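Holo prediction. Input below; ligand is RCQ.
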Amino acid sequence: SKEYHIDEEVGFALPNPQENLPDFYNDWMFIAKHLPDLIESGQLRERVEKLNMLSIDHLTDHKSQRLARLVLGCITMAYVWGKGHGDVRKVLPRNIAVPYCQLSKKLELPPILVYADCVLANWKKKDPNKPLTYENMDVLFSFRDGDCSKGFFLVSLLVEIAAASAIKVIPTVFKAMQMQERDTLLKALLEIASCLEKALQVFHQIHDHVNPKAFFSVLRIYLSGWKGNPQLSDGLVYEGFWEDPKEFAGGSAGQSSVFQCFDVLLGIQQTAGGGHAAQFLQDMRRYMPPAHRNFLCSLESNPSVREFVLSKGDAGLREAYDACVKALVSLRSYHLQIVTKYILIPASQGGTDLMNFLKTVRSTTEKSLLK
Amino acid sequence: KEYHIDEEVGFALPNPQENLPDFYNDWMFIAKHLPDLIESGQLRERVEKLNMLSIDHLTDHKSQRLARLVLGCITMAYVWGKGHGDVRKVLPRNIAVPYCQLSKKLELPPILVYADCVLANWKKKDPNKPLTYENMDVLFSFRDGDCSKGFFLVSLLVEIAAASAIKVIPTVFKAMQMQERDTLLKALLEIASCLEKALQVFHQIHDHVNPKAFFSVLRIYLSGWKGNPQLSDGLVYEGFWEDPKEFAGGSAGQSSVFQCFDVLLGIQQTAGGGHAAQFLQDMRRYMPPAHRNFLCSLESNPSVREFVLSKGDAGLREAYDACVKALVSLRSYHLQIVTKYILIPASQQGTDLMNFLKTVRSTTEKSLLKE
Ligand code: HEM
Ligand code: HEM
Ligand SMILES: Nc1ccc(Cl)cc1-c1ncn[nH]1
Ligand SMILES: Nc1ccc(Cl)cc1-c1ncn[nH]1
Ligand SMILES: Nc1ccc(Cl)cc1-c1ncn[nH]1
Ligand SMILES: Nc1ccc(Cl)cc1-c1ncn[nH]1
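Structure of the complex:
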């Protein structure tokens, strides 16, 4: 595509993100890399309260401003959720609060671990001269041992890389519509469908590397935020930045541009209506990087691929379009079954509005089939 | 460009349609005699006796904007009735279905919206005269003595005064990239000139609106059903949705030209998770699609604010500040209007309203070039 910071190889992810900061900031990363055994010992909160306020004026490139936001975001999650059994810190220490916020609002992100931090900037290749498989990859940061966070972040990133392969044929879709290149558009839409289809096969790998009683009971709590949470009723205080507490939702895959872009490409207005789902997905855009909003906004301001394919009466076109929407329905319906496996049944051993929420998005997707 | 802009009237609808196809005479009669039907108590009767008219005989965009305006005023008149408290909670099928079908086609919620009752609700008496209050009028009003002509036309007149600055928005972004310091100064000054002229047109609101008529009559018919005690969980659109849906009443926050200058001047009115940032973002779902595409696409370009901040140019900075100073004066003068037309009439039988508008103005003066 364009300078929207989209890689041809990994798409919206950060290509080969940085693992080490300037040693100026080694006080920070010492904490982050040893979080699994700093939380167990009741000494993570104390060592955070010890650190003195470092300045953000020495983050040179963009790749280490991201790495900094990941470290500062992972510490912030570990500090406020503690061991994970209902002990909550409602005020973030001053000497890490204002470094987190000063950086965050220079990348136009909210001061909390978002999807682009802990997934897109949170990976590396085992052998740098090797492909992109679950074997040859490893996550840079985890919360506590045995939380399956390496499985969760990676297979989510792997299908992100899988679907993002279709991003570089989006410009083909829009210009085939402009020059009336029917055959090109048809092949373009078919290629998009093959990517969303194989992004579902990569999505099967979650049964192998994430365990339900693990995800629900440890990794869920560290990825929660302080927006509409009874544990942090009025939000979290960023000491020294805002005197009042600020609310921010936790990390979500709805904060991925790849996963929202195909809905606006195919003309599925998932943001239309006053529904809680249409509202959530819109709010989650301000939790995406700025170049990633501008890409979704630019897709919105293009002629509807749907209404174009609708007007042609082309049974070939209308099947290639229906192929893409069937791939999103299958993904969302298979995604519904794992929510039964990884939230519903673990919670058994309120929560019914979650399935309604997701079924709302699936139904709107499935109500966009042409024929 | 293609954002459906007008050289003279801007984001307003250029010379809207005054009549619909005689197929829809059943609708047009109810809208054109809205005060008489409500005054006699026979409006809800003639709406229930309506047959379902297919929206298919509405081809032109202008004939669809007129129908949205007609159906919207009838809808507002049906729900509120006499406006004294006896509200209807179910919108009859024979108007709810054509309403929602048309709203779907135009990507707007099924409720009366600024783009209907201001941008599409006006007429030029003499085509050879200028766009002045004595040359213009409205198409549809709610009650007798509701001062609908004043409120809508003063707003529409202000919208045109500010839209005269939209044509130099590409000049500002052209000059920033080609590094043309002179024309960027001239362009910024021209923007500040138009905004200060809009404040002068805004003064007419004292002449054609009176506080009692607005607060007691017109304000009622603009109220929606989102977060309202009288319609707890929305409105029934019979035959189109099994469940009631919530939607917000009309607001000038639904106007793009009033949100765009904040976006242009780098004044992030939408950053953070505050109520004000949320409300203004929520209102973009109430603007025409091409109008809300223009807002976020302005967010894509490099920020005019940080560019002026780097150039250490007492000329540039004084010109950039002049625009921000014009917004702060418009927003502060608007607060004197609110207390006259809402707060004071409330005191002859509120705060969260003021604290929103104070927060929005406070965010603008934070953008004054001293930080
Ligand atoms: C244990 C595994 C998973 C669980 C329990 C789960 C659960 C959920 C929940 C609760 C939501 C509601 C929105 C929110 O609360 O953030 C959601 C939405 C969503 N999830 Fe997941 N999820 C899982 C794995 C994944 C993965 C691996 C992906 C993609 C790589 C994904 C993609 C999405 C998307 C795109 C949405 C937005 C709604 C939509 O697009 O239909 N999920 N999921
Ligand atoms: C009787 C006269 C008026 C009253 C009582 C009034 C009241 C209000 C209210 C209640 C809001 C908050 C938004 C909402 O609650 O929906 C608001 C905001 C706003 N008003 Fe008005 N209004 C009046 C006239 C006007 C006019 C003629 C304009 C024309 C430009 C205008 C421009 C705006 C704008 C742009 C906002 C959005 C907030 C902002 O941009 O700062 N108002 N006003
Ligand atoms: N796949 C994910 C990866 C990272 C984060 Cl922070 C959240 C998710 C997710 N949110 C909803 N479902 N899955
Ligand atoms: N919308 C989605 C919902 C759930 C899952 Cl698992 C994936 C997607 C998606 N994949 C590509 N685009 N969107
Ligand atoms: N000026 C307006 C014109 C039409 C409608 Cl529906 C609302 C407003 C307004 N809302 C808040 N302030 N002004
Ligand atoms: N932001 C505003 C708030 C209140 C009023 Cl009355 C006008 C404006 C405005 N006019 C042109 N741009 N902005």
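The longest strand of chain B covers residues 90-91. That is the main takeaway for now.
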